[PDB]
């Protein structure tokens, strides 16, 4: 548990509200699945309702003088801070409506209002405002904000336009008519998800839809963002949208541009003595003493000289000019002839572009031209070349805001499409290319070309958004004022997986998973318009992750999947190598990848699904201690092959999956005592609740282990002593003469053979052996049911798994 | 040495659960206020206070996870509402 | 446990002579690199090494201003070129 | 191990005052009767009894001479009036 | 303290494997002859010696029936050909 | 503290009674001096009264059938064990009479009767029997036994015959007339103290004055033993007394006789080949090949051959015969001629005693006599020589029982003295010598001789009673049934000196000193007839003690002197090199030797005298740690020279004497921190009560030390920091310009200079410096009084002693 004072650092007023609400609800209480229609958790829905209600109230406060003084009176009546009244009002309101599911049992609401330290007179209004009408007229702002937040988050409104259809037709009309009187309109802007939009969407909410201009963004729904419009405010204009988003492309990094400058200096340095000597006696330098004339590759070594239009062709048009002039200003005083020969002769496909003072001479021209002052003519022809390409690539950007960024509540400043005869179409994305230069040199049929868009996406995937990715989507949408708040920090903890359903609250388990609430989120990439958020895997684990997604390295990123889910308020998580891999839809959340193992199946509740993978995190934390740096990949494969097989008959056997057949070293003392003991009590705890079989197995193994240390009152046991009497029962249960027996006889003979081999080594009691005999029945009863289902060749492997777990529980009950 | 220095060492003990047991001994004693002593305890369960001849010993406990508790006991003395800490003990116990 | 946080705690021991002795135990073991371990004792005076059955015990000491020395003892083992520490011990001694 | 063996080791501790402190740890526990436990205590002053989760800790004290007292604490548990001793601690303290 | 009485106590440690570990400290130091000290470790396996600033630390071990060993550590110094012992330590260890 | 169960081993019924009584009284309560006339302690007198009362009651019980049934009824009335009623009756009776000294304050008796767990109805009889007459007629045995015990132990009855003069004339007559009716008489036997009587007196009380014959010994008074006579019993006969005590002399040790046999075998072996060859061709062995005949020193080498009458002349007459016959029987089969030549030619002064077959030939006779059968004639002449000397030396023993063992209540069986013409008189003791042989060969004037008595005393001082000795005498006498009970055991503890006047009882301090109560005393030599008991110093310390008493080794045995006193119930102790060194006589006890240091002076109470030497035991225990094996003798001399000088002005300065001038190494850190700290709190405790000056010094040093750590709240002090401000005051107090000053000015200026140098280094308080200033006045007030008395050259040495003690107390108040 972190310092309870240091978490409060950077206290945004919204952060403390979300902290307090999560600190009030039980972990297993907010993780609970909300409704059957879509995957929603109690924690995600209720926090979202309070967050949107807080935003709408602050919008009314900032937009209307009458709503401001109305909120002041409403705040003074209950004697609560303004934003505390607005947030907790919608938070308690949503818990009062989601509790309509079968349990009524409204008694839970009293615990929340108590830990929040709030007057119950406030709850008397909410419990009559969730159902019923206004307490009085002064509660109108809360009635508007909360009913709108309740509307915006129905199980699957699913679309931005569905909000405006639910708006006027259904009972939500009364709230919007009052929102009209607070001079606040509703509005929305639809957008398509794209890689460059992922990094650039944050700047739109700051330089376009900011509070200064009066737009107040609320929530997004994978097909657009929903915000507001205070009356008589300026319309949303596409001119500034294109002005800002094209700037994010036409602003190459200040050190990437320094590298492209160094790529030029790498070539002109290789023959520095010749370029320096060319300041006098050019005819002695250009001609070779044995013959006529030298060619330029003797001065411009091909191994080190990349042509300029290929060097800086990766950047934008304005950045090419800064490269040329910075290289010119840096090296003109030393080797001005190397700069001349480089640009004149190494310009790649547009080779002949230097007609200014272009004598047409192939190589002798250096003797037949004027001095260094002529170099500036190249800078002029660079200005006349890049500024013209600038107008063409800015037009290549515009169509994204004519076709994709569409279906909006904004107006178009842009001149229409027809810059007639588009030179080409992009070969991968399809956007029309108009600039004359681009060719597909990314690093029956003639030539293919690419647009300046998806080359900027490549320069982002090279470092800033390099795969793989953790992806978590929200249903039906997610508040924007909450996306730019949630963060995480795994650098000090790595994996953590210990959670209790009720011993700690949601926020305790939230911070235990490494979740952070900060005013400026830095480890998280919120795809705002997409109602989803993407986590770069490099900021999750320090492993040298590949560019695709290997099935052997999915076993390494998976221990972080449930943590990411809980940090984002129990939401479905997808591990993928590409951002555009679309999610598959149940009332419970799902943790998935491109290829799903069986142990990643979603059990009947979000709490059990999290425990299912948290059990794998505990096993991964033990194999981390056992297998070496090179054996771990082979170790996790043998484990995963068993878990995927055991969970194919029951998930409780997937929790008990460890191996213990052969595979990687069968040596038990090297495996149990070294790593698995500190997590055994947790794996058994998960087993006893994921299925009725696991509850039968957990209670039976402990009832034997408790009786084992009660009979064997000494620590003098061997590995064969506590497991031998059970192995003699398993051998009796699986030899072909007994396999034919009837069900009641096959289990009865095997348990008799088990206790018979036990009583020959140690003395039992008449009243004490009955619990061992009764537990052995339930064990072999399950071994028969997992033989009816599945195979004898697997039931034996499960029996060896259970036989070793008895040794584990015996060492576990002595730990105290 | 003041609580500003001791807090930098305690933040490490509270965050990292790998520290199974740590024993601190001071000479001279670390001086803390009654307020800083209350803030280090307000969330823990007190279990025992015994008044030695000149050293009052008090112990506390936090619940971390599952059945693992972080226990913590003090040896200190008070004068003019100032708290001088003789030694500090932290250890994590499996409690049924 | 990240060595960043362990060094955040050890700096208080190097900078506060009021710390007479500290005994801390890790479970599970804390892993550090050879460079992280050498950077801790780069300026120390090594004393002994004991190659135990499955635990390497080393002892170091530093000198402080006067007749006061700072002792250090740790038990560890190596695996995959990383250093896993079992326990650490510090105490200050005054002698000629 | 029974009290007949432990008494041979305790007679040395009671007679020789040079033993400043001695710590005994048993595995398994030493089994003594309630009578032998009463005879080891009847002349000492009891000071503290705390009931742990499964280990009751009780301490006692004898006056030796001047201001030097022999203190003694136990860690044990009881079943069927049999007393199993986990560990034993003896030390001599200067008490004002 | 006569070595006769100290040997009366150490015989119980050699003869009772239930004694897991014992830490005893002498004040003042107990004096024994070179023959009395050699007769104790005549049948031991010496491990280390540490020539401290003013205290000699030695460690010994014996083997017992199986994979169980009995460790011994003592700190001492010599004066007038007699051996003055500062403290003794015993503990039993099981390992290959 | 020893095992409270293991002390009860060997539980003689009297031992538990003395244990219980001493466990009941406070240490400082029994050590208290009893009366002014003679040195007696409350513990010694009261235990003696109860012990004698127990003996007289058991005598009445065993002698009279009527007293037996009377004691049975008296025991059943109070429901107490018989011997418990008899012992505690006289013990409580004596406390009730000795409390007549000024305090009345009889309240002390209730604590004793309570811890004894006895009914107060018994005390109601005693408190009316000590003063007053019988409770009723049935208490007659107790009235007789206790009044006799009270009579036998008056401050200084001083003589055996004074008991029988106090008997009939004074009020004690009524008790003896009733003792007559219990058929029990009084009797006594006077004896003189002698070394052989010391070891032999125990056997007289067992084989003569035993209960079987009915004599019941009670007490001795340095001039005899007082016992009883049951009527019609046999008279005490001198025949068995001489029969037993002469046997103790005529019974040489079984290994000493083996050594005298080996002294014979050492000679006859040196030329074994010649004696073996003499079995044939004697003429070839006795003659030399170069000349005539060999002389006997060539066969009997002088270096290895002691003459027989000088070898065995140290033993008795019967032991000489056993030496001769055992040597003969052991070696006759091997070298019978060596045995022949040895006895015939090596018989010392009685050289010619072999006339039987004495041919008169000087050396050739071996050729002229018969074979081995003639050797038995020597054994016959040995029988005829030793049996005749036996009758003469037994007569030499008899006069001790005619003259010394005299003034008795026994009858004489012996024929009178006149064996006419005694051959000589002893040169040292004076007893008449009658045997013809003895000459003074102990290892104007002719020859001196010694009797067989003081040669047996020498054979005892050679090993069994070797000096030096601890001697403790009792006044007026000591019960015999108590002498043969008290013992000690220092082998496991060496020196112990920590005692508290009231925190522990007498028995706790008794066993803390190593005192033992055993049925068979083994480390103690009770001189019964001498009313004193002698301790052999070899059984006290393991040091190689000398045969005299060096003044340098007296400093080593002295730490045991007070322990011996307390073990023997606080009685005066004398350390001497000879048993016969007579004690010097005050109301308080005294610890003394041949030459007394001043620090051994007896303070005004037994408790303070014991503390005075117990303080030296604590210092000796520290020098044991400091100085090496060779420096300690020089170290203890420099310490003793100072203690003897400081105690010459006041004993409190003798307790504070440690050295700390120069002398042996002045190095303080090598001396204080290494050894003296653990005993400083005890030395200061002793100082604060031996004189009013010491009480002033102890309270003033601690009042400064407590104020020093209150001002110097840090352990950063140097040796000069806590002592410097006082040294500046001492320098001011002793420089010649201030020595002339008046008393009130010399102390006022020095304390001002002390606090002035202190305030320049540290900050004091207005209310806090007043106690430091007031304590500095009392310190320099005493430094002036120990300069009026004594000298400036000593007051400076005491000031340096006190200045170092301030450093000691500062380190002592921080120990907690
Ligand atoms: Zn494209
Ligand atoms: Zn004589």
Author numbering:
A (entry chain C), F (entry chain C): 1 to 103, 107 to 446, 471 to 611, 613 to 844
B (entry chain A), C (entry chain B), D (entry chain A), E (entry chain B): 1 to 96
Published text:
To understand the molecular architecture of the unique type I-D system as well as mechanism of inhibition by AcrID1, we reconstituted the Cas10d–AcrID1 complex in vitro and determined the crystal structure to 3.5 Å resolution by single-wavelength anomalous dispersion (SAD) phasing using Se–Met substitution. The net result of these interactions is that two AcrID1 dimers sequester two Cas10d subunits into a large, circular 4:2 complex. The buried surface areas between the AcrID1 dimer and the two molecules of Cas10d constitute approximately 930 and 880 Å2 at the two distinct sites of interaction, and size exclusion chromatography supports that this higher-order complex represents the biologically relevant form. In the 2:4 complex of Cas10d and AcrID1 there are no direct interactions between the two Cas10d subunits but several specific interactions between both AcrID1 monomers and each domain of Cas10d that effectively cross-link the Cas10d subunits. These interactions tie one AcrID1 monomer (chain A) to the HD nuclease, Palm/RRM, and Thumb/Cas11 domains of one Cas10d subunit and the other AcrID1 monomer (chain B) to the Cyclase/RRM and C-terminal Thumb domains of another Cas10d subunit. Contacts to the Cyclase/RRM domain are extensive and involve both charged and hydrogen bond interactions to two exposed loops (273–275 and 292–307). The interactions between AcrID1 and the HD nuclease domain are especially intriguing because they involve an N terminal extension of Cas10d (residues 1–13) for which specific contacts are made to both Asn3 and Arg6.
Type I-D CRISPR–Cas systems, which are found both in bacteria and archaea, are exceptional in that they contain a hybrid large subunit, Cas10d, bearing resemblance to both the signature proteins found in type I (Cas3) and type III (Cas10). Here, we present the crystal structure of the Cas10d large effector complex subunit from the Sulfolobus islandicus I-D system, both in isolation and in complex with the Sulfolobus islandicus rod-shaped virus 3 (SIRV3) anti-CRISPR protein, AcrID1. As predicted from comparative sequence analysis, the 847 residue (94 kDa) S. islandicus Cas10d consists of six domains: A HD nuclease domain (1–186), a Cyclase/RRM domain (187–425), a zinc finger domain (426–490), a Palm/RRM domain (491–623), and a C-terminal helical region consisting of a polymerase-like Thumb domain (624–719) and an extension with predicted homology to Cas11 (720–847). In this paper, we demonstrate that the S. islandicus type I-D large subunit, Cas10d, has a unique structure consisting of a type I-like HD nuclease domain joined to a set of inactivated type III-like nucleotidyl transferase domains and a Cas11-like C-terminal domain.
